[PDB]
Design a binder for this molecule. Structure first.
Ligand code: IHP
Ligand code: ATP
Lengths: 1012, 293
């Protein structure tokens, strides 16, 4: 059975069928360089039932720089890499049966042993045996999914082949859309018109079913294919034969399987199917294919890789590429620069690219065994040539090996760049899975290891949890509840002992700005954000903009992800993005007119919070502000209009004292929610009630509710009452036992319980579909007189002790099962949905929606983060604007799109002068320096006349204010009212426009120092 | 007849000005020198002030100082803290023929951080103990209901617009929609009661109640307990309007007695007439006492 507490986030991505398929999955992987290790780690974290790892080579000292598990002892013993890393990888997932193999692979090797596996992955392999294995796997029934990948220096290759036909069960991870129909005409084809406030959001050739249609009742359950007519209409085929349309109707998306056809590896070398990652250079992947095949031919011919700076090797590789290109169908021009750089960096191994392509290959393997997403077809190539391109024409001494744990990276990037990386001071905020793997990548890269400067700073307030163990791979079950930053640091010293790292347990926010002051920011070089929210991103971006430091960011949403690059004096900031504010469910919709499952889920969540978090806190706060019931009685007798005392007394008069009273309170709350409110609403609006135009009131999106009779025999009612009674007894501190939750005891209590009858009322229904949250109805006489009577009777019953006057406040726990919050909210949401004829939702989906849990997987994390690290190298190198590449990806398609980051916009101010966000003007002053002096100094220094000055929220001078010309003569040290915190003050200025009456053109922030 | 021209000429110097609201030590401990509605929210606002907010406020201040509405019937008075911006206060004179005729109404206005994204918060403080629902759009607590403020029913075009809407338009809408001769019909369903003697009679009751409440608070309490912000201005206004105040109150006494002819609603009109006569005697004492300021 699925371990929900470990796997829920991945479950929300894949679906239970995918994991059930992986419960039977056997996967074989051969070749344990960095790429193979990363792929194996990703697959083990995913939860493949059985993984067979394999290698035939032994640990080199060179291999230590490409591995995060091996040790110098392994090299000394010359242990084979497979079983060497087998020890560590076993800790990742006990549920995974990890095995090992070391059978040498060659032409005479029998491949029949591979029949048990569903997917086979090869790395560092020679091409003819790749071809033979591909022939073997595709000839099996069912064919074995074949994946091959390699990494050479700054270049990588990814190929997949799933046989002649590969079944795809799901083409996209999104839920099937549902659209409310406004009108459908009788025509051939019929014209379907949606509620045209919302767009069609569907495409031609898609498949739909329909339900709850009136007028054309024959379309109930009808199944049609569609063709889009407009962004708000579409056709589904003939409807002329149908009856006339009247009202109602919802179009429901139907998910349809698909089959994608893959060609053999050898035949895919010619006319290769390539996926473009840069639409500005779609020719580049074909060039990379040709160059990689030329490198394979060179390796086949000479049994060695080309040497760095070997002109003969580069010439031979160019000749081979030219010859091979002439055998291709398209015969493109061979990129001599690409060939030269490949020859230069043939022997290197660049770890971040390896991790990224490993994550991509892991997702391809995941697709191969499930059919959950549309797979790559068939070739993919990634590049790091941007880094070397900015180097011009360096020389081999930068890249020659020197015997350390960084020779592989040195052969790629050059020794000086490595020294720059070792001297880097990197501040990382947040320690999610992204933070952990980024720290791992830095350890692999030797970043922040130099004694003089190189330091890595990390901070995070959260503690380790079981659910985080699924993708935050550094941690273990016995690390639970330990600080994330501290444990993550401790794990990384194992990877690299030369690292210099500091860790903190602090949330990053304005209150903690004192620790992370601008002096701390100055000591840093680059800042990396692994946040999960927008406001902290805004705060960090504003701080780094104020401190003029580069910033990088990454967001992950299931198979989708993106990377953001910000460089001073070159790009925009995160606070440039103005993504629209999120949706708000109307108050009327949530309270009275829910049309969707999410509405009922939100209603249940809000009701639970109000009942058990908000109201108990209000009760405790009221009985902390006021101490005696008799004192409150004396106050209200003297006309004190105390706030919420009526509701406090109502709650106290309803305070249960034993378990049976708690259960009956739960039952009466059930009645109020599920019969009385529905009856009241239907009393206000009968089923046949109609609008001013005579149209139906209870029509789309207004779904008519229906009252529900209680029945203990119903499992939903049973669970709801059990959870409600447990929660109420927790708040009221009434002790109980698990035997009290038995259906027998509940039946015995219910036989004693009697239910109050419903009564209609004239409470005004806020039908306004744009209605905000209203204010409370004022205290009627009934309220205060009932409050007086009930407090008096409570005093008579002696229910006035501090235990009676205070209750327990329950937090919103969402992951544990014993709290039962998830069960209660699911039961309430299901009841409310059943009221409005809305389909009930399962526990896991309710937990996802109610908890706002982001569906995530470690593979997408590693994929985006490899690119993030790559861009970190470019930021370190100080490359021009062209090098930096913002990127977006959606592995479900799969699709990758590199794009230039947004260029900084020059804010023209006046007379050709302009400023940028990377600008903050300064003026040094003195004690007698005045505001007129400040204005004149600004005019002299920047050639533009100030018009008005403001200190934060506070007006300093405005021309049209009476007698404010005197403020010009006043001195800074007095008018500013400075604090001793700074030598300066920050302020805002605007300047005169060319057209009279236009608002003064805003300039950059201006800082005035009080001294020189 | 030159009274109107002198009224316009004199108080145009008094329409737009600043008066000091915030009181602090050098440590920034926030206090306030007068009564204001949003004391806590001034201290609880975020200090990462957006430059767009300040520039919009300055431009609006210029626009008001250049184009404030001004007539003895209906006028707008602008005062703001001399140091801070988002804290705001207005004074509005009720047009003629209305139950608010020639009364004055002080308002408290606050501007949020996101401004101009959202309309400024507006609330009337002249409700007199916050018990008089002076308008269907102005409840007892003083809440202001207007479409442009997103506090009243209407179309999105009638509602707030961060780019096109201006506070001067809000003030004009207040003058044109709130201080009206038919406030009873402002509530939905009462404009439907128009054309019937019952609706007109209920309007008589409501308008007489509003008349007496205005005479009580908007004139008598505004002169006997003036806010220091508009203290001198309101005294000058009522000094210049003292003759028409007497004429208007005598006319209201005569007219409210016409409504008093009815048996039951005329009894409520008699109560309002007694209150009106009491407050008229008090205001007449004040007018006799009040010299040229
Ligand atoms: O205060 P909230 O938690 O937001 O919910 C309240 C609450 O219902 P519960 O009894 O389920 O807590 C009120 O009951 P009391 O707190 O006063 O006991 C009830 O008011 P009534 O007792 O008058 O029914 C009111 O319902 P309504 O707004 O229809 O008056 C309802 O509000 P919701 O509809 O948002 O739950
Ligand atoms: N302002 C902040 N300062 C420091 N750390 C922050 C800040 N905001 C968020 N974080 C960190 O961001 C991390 C987010 O990590 P991640 O996206 O992997 O999920 P999570 O919070 O561990 O768990 P879940 O899956 O329940 O959301 C948290 O560990 C949290 O500590």
């Amino acid at each position: 059975e699925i371990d929900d507490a470990l796997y829920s986030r991945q479950r929300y991505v894949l679906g239970d069928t995918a994991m059930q398929k992986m419960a039977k999955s056997h996967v074989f992987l051969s070749g344990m360089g960095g790429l193979g290790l990363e792929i194996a780690k990703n697959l083990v974290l995913a939860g493949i039932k059985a993984v067979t790892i394999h290698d035939t080579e032994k640990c080199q000292a060179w291999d230590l720089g490409t591995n995060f598990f091996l040790s110098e002892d392994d090299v000394v013993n010359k242990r084979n890499r497979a079983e060497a890393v087998l020890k560590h990888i076993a800790e990742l997932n006990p549920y995974v049966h990890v095995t090992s193999s070391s059978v040498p692979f060659n032409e005479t090797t029998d491949l029949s042993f591979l029949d048990k596996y569903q997917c086979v992955v090869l790395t560092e392999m020679k091409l003819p045996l790749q071809k033979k294995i591909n022939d073997f796997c595709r000839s099996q029934c069912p064919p074995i999914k074949f994946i091959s990948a390699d990494v050479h220096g700054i270049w990588s290759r990814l190929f997949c082949d799933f046989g002649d036909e590969f079944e795809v069960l799901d083409t996209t991870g999104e839920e099937p859309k549902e659209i409310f129909i406004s009108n459908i005409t009788q025509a051939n084809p019929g014209i379907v018109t949606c509620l045209e406030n919302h767009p069609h959001k569907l495409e031609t050739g898609q498949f739909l079913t329909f339900r709850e249609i009136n007028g054309m009742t024959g379309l109930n359950g009808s199944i049609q294919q569609i063709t889009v007519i407009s962004p708000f209409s579409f056709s589904i085929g003939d409807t002329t034969e149908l009856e006339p349309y009247l009202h109602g109707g919802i179009a429901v998306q139907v998910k349809t399987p698909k089959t994608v056809f893959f060609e053999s590896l050898e035949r895919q070398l010619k006319h290769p199917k390539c996926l473009i990652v840069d639409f500005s250079n779609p020719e580049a992947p074909l060039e990379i294919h040709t160059a990689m095949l030329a490198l394979d031919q060179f390796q086949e011919k000479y049994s060695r890789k080309p040497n760095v700076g070997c002109q003969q090797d580069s010439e031979e590789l160019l000749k081979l590429a030219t010859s091979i290109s002439e055998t291709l169908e398209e015969k493109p021009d061979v990129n001599a620069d690409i060939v030269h750089w490949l020859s230069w960096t043939a022997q290197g191994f660049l770890s971040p690219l390896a991790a990224a392509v490993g994550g991509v290959a892991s997702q391809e393997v995941l697709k191969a065994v499930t059919g959950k997403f549309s797979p790559l077809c068939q070739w993919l190539y990634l590049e790091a040539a941007d880094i070397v391109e900015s180097l011009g024409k360096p020389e081999c001494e930068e890249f020659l090996p020197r015997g350390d744990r960084y020779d592989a990276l040195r052969a790629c990037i050059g020794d000086t760049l490595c020294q720059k990386l070792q001297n880097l001071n990197i501040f990382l905020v947040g320690c999610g899975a992204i933070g952990c793997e980024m720290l791992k990548n830095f350890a692999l890269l030797g970043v922040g290891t130099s004694k003089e400067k190189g330091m890595i700073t990390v901070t995070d307030p959260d503690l380790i949890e079981k659910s985080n163990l699924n993708r935050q791979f550094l941690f273990r079950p016995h690390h639970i509840q330990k600080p994330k930053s501290y444990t993550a640091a401790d794990a990384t010293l194992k990877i690299n002992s030369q690292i210099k790292i500091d860790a903190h347990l602090n949330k990053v926010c304005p209150t903690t700005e004192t620790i992370y002051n601008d002096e701390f920011y100055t000591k840093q070089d680059v800042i990396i954000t692994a946040l999960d929210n927008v406001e902290a991103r805004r705060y960090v971006d504003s701080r780094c903009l104020a401190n003029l430091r580069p910033l990088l960011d990454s967001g992950t949403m299931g198979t989708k992800g993106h990377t953001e690059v910000i460089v001073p004096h070159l790009t925009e900031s995160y606070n440039s993005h103005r993504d629209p504010p999120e949706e708000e469910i109307p108050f009327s919709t949530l309270k009275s007119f829910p049309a969707a499952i999410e509405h009922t889920i939100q209603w249940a969540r809000d009701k639970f919070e109000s009942s058990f978090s908000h109201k108990p806190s209000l009760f405790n706060k009221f009985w902390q502000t006021y101490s005696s019931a008799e004192e409150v009685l004396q106050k209200i007798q003297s006309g004190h209009s105390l706030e919420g005392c009526f509701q406090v007394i109502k709650l106290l008069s309803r305070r249960p004292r034993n378990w049976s009273q708690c259960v009956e309170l739960a039952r009466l709350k059930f009645e109020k929610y599920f019969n009385h409110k529905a009856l009241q609403l239907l009393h206000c609006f009968p089923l046949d009630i109609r609008l001013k135009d005579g149209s139906l009131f209870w029509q789309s999106p207004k779904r008519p509710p229906s009252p529900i009779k209680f029945d203990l025999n119903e499992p939903l009612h049973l669970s709801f009452l059990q959870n409600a009674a447990k929660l109420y007894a927790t708040v009221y501190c009434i002790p109980f036992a698990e035997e009290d939750l038995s259906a027998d005891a509940l039946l015995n209590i219910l036989s004693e319980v009697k239910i109050q009858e419903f009564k209609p009322s004239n409470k005004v229904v806020q039908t306004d579909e744009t209605a905000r949250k209203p204010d409370h109805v004022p205290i009627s006489s009934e309220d205060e007189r009932n409050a007086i009577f009930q407090l008096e009777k409570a005093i008579l019953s002696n229910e006035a002790t501090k235990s009676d006057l205070q209750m327990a406040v329950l937090s919103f726990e969402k992951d544990d099962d014993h709290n039962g919050h998830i069960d209660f909210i699911t039961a309430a949401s299901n009841l409310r949905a059943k009221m409005y004829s809305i389909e009930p939702a399962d526990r896991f989906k309710t937990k996802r929606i109610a908890g706002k849990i982001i569906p995530a997987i470690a593979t997408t994390t590693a994929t985006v983060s490899g690119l993030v690290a790559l861009e970190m190298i470019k930021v370190t190198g100080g490359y021009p604007f062209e090098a930096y590449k913002n990127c977006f990806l959606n592995l479900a398609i799969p699709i990758v799109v590199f794009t230039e980051t947004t260029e900084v916009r020059k804010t023209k101010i006046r007379n050709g002068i302009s400023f940028t966000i990377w600008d903050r003007w300064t003026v040094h002053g003195k004690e007698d320096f005045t505001l007129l002096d400040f204005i004149n100094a600004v005019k002299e220094k920047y050639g533009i006349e100030p018009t008005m000055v403001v200190q934060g929220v506070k007006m300093l001078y405005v021309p049209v204010m009476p007698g404010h010309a005197k403020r010009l003569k006043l001195t800074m040290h007095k008018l500013v009212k400075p604090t001793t915190e700074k030598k300066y003050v920050d302020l805002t200025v605007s300047f005169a426009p060319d057209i009279d009456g236009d608002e003064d053109l805003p300039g950059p922030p201006v800082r005035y120092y009080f001294s020189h | 007849k030159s009274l109107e021209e002198k009224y316009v000429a004199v108080m145009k110097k008094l329409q737009f000005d600043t008066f000091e609201m915030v009181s602090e030590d050098e440590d920034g401990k926030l206090g306030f020198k007068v009564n204001y509605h949003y004391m806590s929210q001034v201290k609880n606002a975020n200090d990462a002030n957006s430059a767009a907010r300040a520039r919009r406020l300055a431009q609006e201040a210029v626009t008001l100082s250049t184009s404030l509405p001004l007539s003895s019937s209906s006028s707008v008075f602008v005062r703001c803290d001399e140091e801070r911006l988002d804290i705001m206060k207005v004074l509005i004179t009720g047009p003629a023929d209305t139950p608010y005729a020639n009364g004055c109404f002080e308002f408290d206005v606050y501007f949020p951080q996101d401004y101009p994204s959202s309309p400024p918060l507006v609330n009337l403080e002249t409700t007199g103990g916050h018990s008089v629902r002076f308008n269907p759009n102005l409840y007892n607590d003083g809440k202001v209901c207007l479409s442009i403020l997103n506090t009243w029913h209407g179309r999105p075009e009638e509602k707030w617009n961060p780019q096109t809407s201006s506070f001067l338009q809000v003030l004009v809408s207040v003058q044109s929609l709130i201080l009206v001769a038919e406030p009873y019909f402002n509530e939905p369903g009462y404009e439907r009661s128009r054309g019937t003697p019952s609706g007109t009679q209920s309007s008589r009751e409501y308008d007489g109640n509003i008349r007496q409440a205005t005479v009580k608070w908007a004139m008598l309490e505004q002169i006997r307990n003036p806010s220091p912000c508009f203290k001198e201005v309101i005294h000058k206004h009522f000094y210049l309007k003292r003759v028409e105040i007497m004429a208007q109150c005598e006319e209201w006494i005569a007219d409210i007695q016409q409504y008093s002819s009815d048996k039951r609603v005329g009894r409520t009109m008699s109560h309002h007439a007694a209150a009106l006569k009491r407050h008229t005697a008090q205001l007449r004492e004040e007018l006799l006492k009040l010299p040229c300021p």
